[PDB]
Amino acid sequence: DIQLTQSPSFLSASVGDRVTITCRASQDISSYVAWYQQKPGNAPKLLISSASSRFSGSRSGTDFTLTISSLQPEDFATYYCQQLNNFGPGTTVDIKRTVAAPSVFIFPPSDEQLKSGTASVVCLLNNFYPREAKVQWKVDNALQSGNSQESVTEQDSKDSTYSLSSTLTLSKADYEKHKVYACEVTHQGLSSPVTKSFNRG
Amino acid sequence: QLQLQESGPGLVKPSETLSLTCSVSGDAISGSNYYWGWIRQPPGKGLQWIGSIYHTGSTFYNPSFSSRVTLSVDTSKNQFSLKLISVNAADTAVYYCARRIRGYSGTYDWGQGTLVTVSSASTKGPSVFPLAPSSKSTSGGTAALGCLVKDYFPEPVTVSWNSGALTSGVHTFPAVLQSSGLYSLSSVVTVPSSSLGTQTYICNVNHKPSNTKVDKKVEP
Numbered sequence: 313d314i315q316l317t318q319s320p321s322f323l324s325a326s327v328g329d330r331v332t333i334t335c336r337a338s339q340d341i342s343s344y345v346a347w348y349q350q351k352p353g354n355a356p357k358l359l360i361s362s363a364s365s366r367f368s369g370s371r372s373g374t375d376f377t378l379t380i381s382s383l384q385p386e387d388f389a390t391y392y393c394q395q396l397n398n399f400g401p402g403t404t405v406d407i408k409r410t411v412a413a414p415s416v417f418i419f420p421p422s423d424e425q426l427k428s429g430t431a432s433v434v435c436l437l438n439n440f441y442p443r444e445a446k447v448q449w450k451v452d453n454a455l456q457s458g459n460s461q462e463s464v465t466e467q468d469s470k471d472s473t474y475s476l477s478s479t480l481t482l483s484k485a486d487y488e489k490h491k492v493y494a495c496e497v498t499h500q501g502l503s504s505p506v507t508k509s510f511n512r513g
Numbered sequence: 514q515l516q517l518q519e520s521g522p523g524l525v526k527p528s529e530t531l532s533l534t535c536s537v538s539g540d541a542i543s544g545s546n547y548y549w550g551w552i553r554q555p556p557g558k559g560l561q562w563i564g565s566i567y568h569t570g571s572t573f574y575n576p577s578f579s580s581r582v583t584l585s586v587d588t589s590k591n592q593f594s595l596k597l598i599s600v601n602a603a604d605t606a607v608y609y610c611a612r613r614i615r616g617y618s619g620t621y622d623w624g625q626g627t628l629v630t631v632s633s634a635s636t637k638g639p640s641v642f643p644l645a646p647s648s649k650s651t652s653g654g655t656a657a658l659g660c661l662v663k664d665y666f667p668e669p670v671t672v673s674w675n676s677g678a679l680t681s682g683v684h685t686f687p688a689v690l691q692s693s694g695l696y697s698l699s700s701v702v703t704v705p706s707s708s709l710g711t712q713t714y715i716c717n718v719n720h721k722p723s724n725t726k727v728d729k730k731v732e733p
Contacts, residue, residue, distance in 0.1 A: 344618040355609055355623040356560065363618035392560060394621065397550070397573075397613070399560040417650035417657040417701075422642040425661070434644055436657055436701055438684070463686040463698065475684045477699050479661075481691075510649050 314338045316393055316400035324406040327472070329383045333403045335376040335393030345369065345376040348392045350402075352466040356392060383407070386469045407472040413501030414440035414476070418494075418508040421487065431487035435495030435508065437476035439468070446498035447478040450507075452490045456480065487512070515539035517610045517624035523722055524630050524667045525604075531597040531629055535610030536590075542568050543588040546615045551584070551595045553606040554626070561606075565613070566593055605631045630667040634694055638723030639665035641716070643731040644699060651706055658731045659701030660716035664693070665723070672700040673717040679704075709733050 315338040325331050335345055344363045348356035360378070362369050366387075370377045380387060388407050393400040414437035421431040437445055443464065449456035459482060465475045478495065494509035521533035535549070542549060550565035564574040566584040574582050578597070586593040597604060607626040613619040644650075644659035651657075662670050672685045685700040700716060718727040 342617040346620045348621070355626050356621075357623070358620050361618065361620050363620075396617065396619070397548075397562045397565065399552075399562065402559045415652045415655070415657075417652070419644040419650060419659070422645070422661075425640070425642045425663075428640070432642070432661055432663065432697075434659075434661065434699055436650075436659075436699075438657065438701075438703065461689045461691070461697075463689050465684050465686060475686075475701070477686050477701070479689075479697070479699065508649060 314341055314395070314398055316395060316398050318391075318393060318400040318403045320403060321401070322404045322406070324408045325383050326408045327383055327385055331380040331383050331405060333378045333391055333405075334372065335378070335400050336374070337376075337395060337398075340374060342395050344395065346394045347378045348394060349387075349389045350392065351386075351389045351469065359391070380405075385409075385472045388467045388469055388472065407467055409441050409472040411501045412439060412441040412473055414438055414445065414497060414499055414506075416495065416497050416506050416508045418510060420493065420510050420512070426484055426487075429484045431482045431484055433480040433482075433487075433493050435478045435480075435497075437474075437478075437497060437499075439471065439473040439475060440499060440501060441473050442500065443474050444500070445476055447476070448496045448498075449478070449480050450494045450496060452492050453494075515622055517612065517622065519608060519610050519624050519627040521627065521629075523628055524632065524636060525600050526633055527601050527631055528599055531595070531600050531604060531631075533595045533608055533610070533627065533629070534592050535594070535624060536592050537612075538591075542586060542591050542593065544568060547612045548573070548615065548619075549586065549593045550611050550613065551608060552611050552621075552623075553608045555603070555606040558606075563595065563597075563608075600631045602631050605629065628668055632667060634666050636722045637664065637666045637695060638725035639663060639670060639718065639720050639727075641718045641727045641729045643729060644701060645731060646704075646709060646733050654706045655703050656706045656709055657701055657703050658714055659699050660718060660729055660731065661697070661699050662718050662720075663697045664691075664695040665697075665720050665725075666695050667722060668696060670696075670698065670718060670720045672698075672719075674700070674702050675713075675715055676717060679714070
C-alpha cells in the first residue's frame, strides 16, 4: 500500500485568513482524494472529495491541496486526507485571536467530600487566550508544589478561547491545617497577577 | 438516515480479546458494494485502518495487526463485527466502525466511535461533588458553578447541565489520571448572577461502565 503525508502538520492562523493544507502520496495510485474534518470529541466527517463554499481542493505538482478561503473559529479541527483505505497523519489547525484575560473563580471543597477524607480545591481560569498561563497555589501565604493538576479545554469553537482548571488535592487533615487558600494567576492579558482566595472557616 | 452504531465493552483485560459490533441502519449490508470496516484512533494519534469486510464475507486486513484481527458479517442482522485477540495497552483507542464504497473515489461514512481501554484495573463509579457558586465565584453579573466528578475508571463519563438545556458557557474538562490510577474531571458553567435564586442548576453525570447515573443539584 501507500503512505500519505500532510503539510503543515500543525498551524495557527487568524479568523479570515486563507489556509492551504497539502496531501502527498508516496506513489501515484489515484487521481481522487478526499478530506475529513475532525472537531474535538467527534468522529471525522467528510469535507470535500475531488470526485464530486469556503473549502476547495486542487493539485500542486503531484500534491493535493485543501484550501479554506476564510478561516472561521468553528474550523478549529484536525484535517485528514484519504485515498482508498489510506489516511494522512492529520493537520491540526488552531485559531490565533487577540489576547483575552482569564476570569478567575475559586471553589472550596464540598462538605460531602470533606466527610470522605479528601479535599479538592478548584481554581477556574475561564475564556482566556493565549493558552500560556501560570497558576500558583498559596496556602497561608506559602507556595504549594506537587499537589495540583491542571486541565485545559480545547479551543472554543465560537470565541477561540481556552479554559483551565487547576485542582489542589489534599487529605482532609492537610486541608484542615491551614486557613487561607489562594489561587494566583499570571497571564499576558493581566497587568498584575490576580489572586482569588477563601478562608477554610 | 445511515447510522453506524458501535457496541461492546469499554474495558478489556491485557491478553484478552477485544470484541465490538456495528449495527447498521438506513442501509443494507447484504448486496451492497461497500467495504464495511473498522478504524481506530489511539489517544493523541491519527487514524489507523484495521480491516474491512464485503457483504460476501471476504475480508482485508492491515498487516500491522499480525493476523490478530478477525472481521465477520451477519447479513441477517445487518451487523458486522471486530475481534482483536491478545490486546495490550497499545490497543487502547477509540474504535469507529465505518463504510466506504468500492472504487478509487470511495469516501468513508463514520460511526460515532467507542473508547476501549486495555487495563487490568477494575471498574469504579465516580463520586460527584458540587462546585458551589458563591461570592468567590462571581465576576460582575456572572457566576461560575460546576460539578467535580472524582475517582472513576475507566473513561468516559458524560456530563450535561439541566438535561441539555444549558450548553452556553459549559466547559467539561478533559479527564486527568490521578496517581491512584483513577480519573477525575470537573464540568463548569457560567450563568447570570441574578438567576441563581430562581433557576435550579443540575449536572447530569453518567458513567456507563459502573451504571452510575447522578443528577446533582448545585446550590449557592
